Design a protein around this ligand. Structure first.
Ligand SMILES: [Zn+2]
Lengths: 16, 16
């Protein structure tokens, strides 16, 4: 979801 | 590489 689907990281698989 | 590109973990790309 968009608020944590951020460009400024990432590997989103380790965030929620 | 194949030896540690295993199902026996994993997210190989930064795990060991
Ligand atoms: Zn990862």
């Amino acid at each position: 979801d968009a608020e944590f689907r951020r460009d400024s990281g990432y590997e989103v698989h380790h965030q929620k």
